[PDB]
Amino acid sequence: SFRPCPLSQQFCGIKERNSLKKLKAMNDACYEKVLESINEGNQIIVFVHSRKETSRTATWLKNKFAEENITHKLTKNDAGSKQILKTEAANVLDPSLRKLIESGIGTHHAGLTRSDRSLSEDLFADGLLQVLVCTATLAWGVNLPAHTVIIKGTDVYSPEKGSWEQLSPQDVLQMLGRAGRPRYDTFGEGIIITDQSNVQYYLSVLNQQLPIESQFVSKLVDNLNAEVVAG
């Protein structure tokens, strides 16, 4: 309640089961959300699980909007804007992500060049990038908020277990944190695209119910050793 921009929480709640349909459904939902947003002049972030996912998502987005309307994302006349784009498009953008950037729905992830990543970060800040597909780096690191924040999916793979776990509350909260800009905009759009069964669990997490539970059992021994060494 004491937050600068109040966070409008939202869940999709996917009913589908099989992964080929489910994914499609999720994509559709995302598109719908994006459509709802961009018409209001809303700059938007789409979190995903993995690095490889992001680019594909971006590609999908590109193929969907061009059928209906290319114009709403590049609306400006672009005499100076175009020039700017030219300047900051084909410098060192290697990963075949340059096309995405050109389109105007780019991405930032661990596995994009330090220069490239920086550019991506600033291509929002300067005031041009509409949509931003993202891994969970941005939430952890960078302060840059972006009105609409969609979290695509539940199942992250952790090598800790060696299994597809649900999105952990501590990360989800962090992700949600970046939203409507405290300085400029009034409020924030927070969306979770998810499986319907795990929403019941997620709702509680969203209300900040699950506390700080200690994980000192793994890191105890080393600490103890260090202490001993210290004398």
Place this chain on the structure above:
RNA sequence: AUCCUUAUGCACGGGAAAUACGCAUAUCAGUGAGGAUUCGUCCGAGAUUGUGUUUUUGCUGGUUGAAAUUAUAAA
């Protein structure tokens, strides 16, 4: 109040069939449709036309393949 008959409506349940099942600004039709016949008579409700699907509508599930793919980060 108890038991039954008929029709219907809603359903459990069990079957068969979809070569069937509709629809119509149509034409006609118990003031006769279409049929029987031992030829005396008898049954009595659709027919014509047009047309929409019709080896099938709607949904689910699996195996598969398809190639099915794993977050960040400090020392």
